[PDB]
Design a protein around this ligand. Structure first.
Ligand SMILES: [Mg+2]
Ligand SMILES: [Mg+2]
Ligand SMILES: [Mg+2]
Ligand SMILES: [Mg+2]
Ligand SMILES: [Mg+2]
Ligand SMILES: [Mg+2]
Ligand SMILES: [Mg+2]
Ligand SMILES: [Zn+2]
Lengths: 94, 130, 135, 38, 136
RNA sequence: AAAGUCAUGGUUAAGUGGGAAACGAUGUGGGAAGGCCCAGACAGCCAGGAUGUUGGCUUAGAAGCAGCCAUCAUUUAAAGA
């Protein structure tokens, strides 16, 4: 059972996303169901060890944000073009 | 190899130790292939592939199972003397094959303690009950 | 003490063109290299290569313990082949059947090294497969 | 001696050493594997 | 040497080579040779790096070449002045951006494909890195 | 040659700073897992590297070592035709 921490993004856009990935982070979003989309930001080195498992893209993950277990699945991922890093992850609510 | 499968290789000592009563010892200053074959080619004409010629005489491995079973062996952790637990026997006839191979091209690393199964002395009691 | 095995089959007694200087190194005269080679060679069936152990005692004498011929020649009578394996995977020579090895497995269970005949059975499987002749 | 911009362990008994600011490959089994970076 | 069988036009402008690459995932095989550098690969460079990885795996496996040279390059000869036309087509290139998987392979152990994409990276003028197939 | 031999916390030992690439290298600082261990590791020292076996040919003799092939398998601590 993967558990991932997350804070809610204050600022959004092109320059703010560049400014997170410098500081060992990357933005994500959770979308699905009756509830609005939730734009969160993740820690880069914690997820990059989890993502190297083939069990990551098949199980129902749990993101903890503002004290709330949200059970989502990995829908899409943007990888860096030549560095082994992560740019952005989509999550669809389970 | 990781420690959990080593933790059944402490269990693998026990049931060999539990069944075995008589044990003879050796060391290797000049460990030859054939100097261990002298006791195993001799073993096949008597019994099976039951026996281990491997060593467990390390400062935690045969030390922990010693208050468990056969408590005299908690002193021979160091000083380079190993264990080979033959499963049957009661003062059997399988002693000097590690020891007579010392005279035949080996330079005496063992000093042949004898394991004291009737709690005997260090002298070889070559009487063998037929 | 140099107990290595070097001769050809029975038809060449005192075999100076096959042996040469090989067993002729020591101070032992050749009259017990040729005629005391016949204590096992003419003692059985001729023509087949018996290896013989020479350990040179200090009194110019020797004794030995006999054994079976190699995995070529006792299997060569069970093959009949003359050239061994001429490029097997690019064109085949033949094969060795498994069940024919039983007669030799009950033959060589006297001196050949070990007590488990069944463990010697898969020993002559892959050894027969080693000869270009897939068992 | 070999003098090369690329020096390497060529066999199993080659040791890479740095003496006075130069990477050298000194060997003990083979005299042909001795090297000096240049 | 790879080359188009036909072109609509014989010549082309020079252009620029900015941007990131598109064929970034390993699509077909299991392992890749991704481009970290920028530049252009001529057809003699693409094909010398193919003979070096084909020989290294001993005709056992399957190789993909993800890039094709289709930009013709002109040159003017020696002792020719600057006007009087555009030069004659001399060779063919492929324009490479950072993030381009160049070659692919499967059907080999991963340790054999480390060492064949090393003997073939030697013949290329851009800096490369070894990638594998990812799940999503 | 006018104005900080300024404070604080780091890095560099190359006069790098104060010219140059593919490539090479136990140079040195930092970081999350990387990755083997008190069922004694890692490095040295006490030691084998057997057995069938020399696996057979074409060759100059072909035996692990000229190349060509199978490269299994026993006595099984382990020893790879
Ligand atoms: Mg901007
Ligand atoms: Mg000097
Ligand atoms: Mg343009
Ligand atoms: Mg483009
Ligand atoms: Mg002044
Ligand atoms: Mg100061
Ligand atoms: Mg060590
Ligand atoms: Zn060397």
């Amino acid at each position: 059972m993967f558990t991932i921490n997350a804070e809610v993004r204050k600022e959004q856009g092109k320059g703010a996303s560049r400014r997170l990935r410098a500081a060992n982070k990357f933005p994500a979003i959770i979308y699905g169901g009756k509830e609005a989309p939730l734009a969160i930001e993740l820690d880069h080195d914690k997820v990059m060890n989890m993502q190297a498992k083939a069990e990551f893209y098949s199980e129902v993950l749990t993101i903890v944000v503002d004290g709330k277990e949200i059970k989502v699945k990995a829908q899409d991922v943007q990888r860096h073009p030549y560095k082994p890093k992560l740019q952005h992850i989509d999550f669809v609510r389970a | 190899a990781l420690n959990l499968q080593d933790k059944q290789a402490i269990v693998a000592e026990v049931s060999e130790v539990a069944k075995g009563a008589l044990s003879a010892v050796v060391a290797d200053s000049r460990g030859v292939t054939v100097d261990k074959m002298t006791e195993l080619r001799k073993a096949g004409r008597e019994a099976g592939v039951y026996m281990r010629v491997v060593r467990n005489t390390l400062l935690r491995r045969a030390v922990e199972g010693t208050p468990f079973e056969c408590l005299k062996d908690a002193f021979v952790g160091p000083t380079l003397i190993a264990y080979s637990m033959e499963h049957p026997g009661a003062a059997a006839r399988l002693f000097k094959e590690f020891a007579k191979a010392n005279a035949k091209f080996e330079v005496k690393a063992a000093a042949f303690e004898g394991e004291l199964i009737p709690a005997s002395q260090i002298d070889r009691l070559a009487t063998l009950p037929t | 003490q140099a107990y290595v095995k070097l001769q050809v089959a029975a038809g060449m007694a005192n075999p100076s063109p096959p042996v040469g200087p090989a067993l002729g190194q020591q101070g032992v005269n050749i009259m017990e290299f040729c005629k005391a080679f016949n204590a096992k060679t003419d003692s059985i069936e001729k023509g087949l290569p018996i290896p013989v152990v020479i350990t040179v005692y200090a009194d110019r004498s020797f004794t030995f313990v006999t054994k079976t011929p190699p995995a070529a020649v006792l299997l060569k009578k069970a093959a009949g082949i003359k050239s061994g394996s001429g490029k097997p995977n690019k064109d085949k020579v033949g094969k060795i059947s498994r069940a024919q090895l039983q007669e030799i497995a009950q033959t060589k269970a006297a001196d050949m090294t070990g007590a488990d005949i069944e463990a010697m059975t898969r020993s002559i499987e892959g050894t027969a497969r080693s000869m270009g002749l897939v068992v | 001696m070999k003098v090369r911009a690329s020096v390497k362990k060529l066999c199993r008994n080659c040791k890479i050493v740095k003496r006075d600011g130069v990477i050298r490959v000194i060997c003990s089994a083979e005299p042909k594997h001795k090297q000096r970076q240049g | 040497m790879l080359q188009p069988k036909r072109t609509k036009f014989r010549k082309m402008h020079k252009g620029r080579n900015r941007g990131l690459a598109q064929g970034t995932d390993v699509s077909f095989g299991s392992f890749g040779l991704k481009a970290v550098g920028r530049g252009r690969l001529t057809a003699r460079q693409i094909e010398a790096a193919r003979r070096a990885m084909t020989r290294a795996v001993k005709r056992q496996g399957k190789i993909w070449i993800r890039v094709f040279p289709d930009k013709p390059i002109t040159e003017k000869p020696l002792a020719v002045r600057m006007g009087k036309g555009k030069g004659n087509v001399e060779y063919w290139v492929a324009l490479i951006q950072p993030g381009k998987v160049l070659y692919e392979m499967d059907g080999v152990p991963e340790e054999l494909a480390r060492e064949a994409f090393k003997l073939a990276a030697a013949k290329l003028p851009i800096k490369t890195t070894f990638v594998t197939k990812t799940v999503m």
